[PDB]
Design a protein around this ligand. Structure first.
Ligand SMILES: CCCCC[C@H](NC(=O)OCc1ccccc1)P(=O)(O)O[C@H](C(=O)O)c1cccc(NC(=N)N)c1
Ligand SMILES: [Zn+2]
Length: 304
């Protein structure tokens, strides 16, 4: 069965996407935006009160297989939305005015692999010509200074950038969806762990986004809000200098598509447990993260 305070396997998450949609048809619609290399369905939940030409915020989880708290957060977010709509003024306003496009798990094949074989797997699970080595790093696989830095051209490496940008079915599917909905998508949020950071562009170069001052102010406010709940300390800044240079990331790509608010979130913790964050921290992690995501949403709505 599904639990919001446990890590759920794909079969359970999949069944959950069907159930939560079935139970909340006036707030959620479910679509598939493609298949993974191994034929799993890439679900996308449109969360919001339906209406004509609404703006949207896009959020994905589960880019990286081992970052289990990421997957947990997208599920937590959806429950919070449906439970508090009509009762909490901000979320009610949010869902009335815009849609959240929530992609609960992008790298499903890798996620399944962390459940069945290797808890520390990162990449996709696609085959590579000429080698037995498996998988591409999905966050090195986007058309953003592709493979020029912080990436490997070797399929045996953890940051393999792929044979070409969007060579992976999963990243192609995500990019296709965002490109098809650029007129509506006002912010892109991609959830990772760990490090307790909010990053904005750029990572593929040391150059700064034109609205750099705005993004720094937004991230600064978001981390302050997050800390109010349990005192959790986040840092923030442009990817390249705040964590490390790395090309081919979806946050940079999305920004260069014209989505002016693009953030990579790195959730708890700081390395005590690392990727193996205890289930006992799921609820607190998700609760404080909700505050930061809602703050960003409120800001974006006031700047349409
Ligand atoms: C403190 C340890 C965890 C740090 C964050 C994670 N990084 C990570 O696992 O790197 C692993 C690795 C790095 C180098 C060699 C081998 C393995 P991540 O969630 O994979 O980090 C993202 C990534 O590298 O794709 C990330 C973090 C911040 C910004 C961006 N954006 C971007 N365009 N690179 C991307
Ligand atoms: Zn990651």
């Amino acid at each position: 069965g599904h639990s919001y305070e446990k890590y759920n396997n794909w079969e359970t998450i999949e069944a959950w996407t069907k159930q939560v949609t079935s139970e909340n048809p006036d707030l959620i619609s479910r679509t598939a935006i493609g298949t993974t290399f191994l034929g799993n369905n890439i679900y996308l939940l449109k969360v919001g009160k339906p209406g004509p030409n609404k703006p949207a915020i896009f959020m994905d989880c589960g880019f990286h297989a081992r970052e289990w708290i990421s997957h947990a957060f997208c599920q937590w977010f959806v429950r919070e939305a449906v439970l508090t709509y009509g009762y909490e003024s901000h979320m009610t306003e949010f869902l009335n005015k815009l849609d959240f496009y929530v992609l609960p798990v992008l790298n499903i094949d890798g996620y399944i692999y962390t459940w069945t074989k290797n808890r520390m797997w990162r990449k996709t699970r696609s085959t590579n010509a000429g080698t037995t080595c498996i998988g591409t790093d999905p966050n090195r696989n986007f058309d953003a200074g592709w493979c020029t830095t912080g990436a490997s051209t070797d399929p045996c490496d953890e940051t393999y950038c792929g044979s070409a940008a969007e060579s992976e079915k999963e990243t192609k599917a995500l990019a296709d969806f965002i490109r098809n909905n650029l007129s509506s998508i006002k912010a892109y949020l991609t959830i990772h762990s760990y490090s307790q950071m909010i990053l904005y562009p750029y990572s593929y170069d040391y150059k700064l986004p034109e609205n750099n001052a705005e993004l720094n102010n937004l991230a600064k406010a978001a981390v302050k809000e997050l800390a109010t709940l349990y005192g959790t300390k986040y840092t923030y800044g442009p990817g390249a200098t705040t964590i490390y240079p790395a090309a081919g990331g979806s946050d940079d790509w999305a920004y260069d598509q014209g989505i002016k608010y693009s953030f990579t979130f790195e959730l708890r913790d700081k390395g005590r447990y690392g990727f193996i964050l205890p289930e006992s921290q799921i609820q607190a992690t998700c609760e404080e993260t909700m505050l930061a995501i809602k703050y960003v949403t409120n800001y974006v709505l006031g700047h349409l």
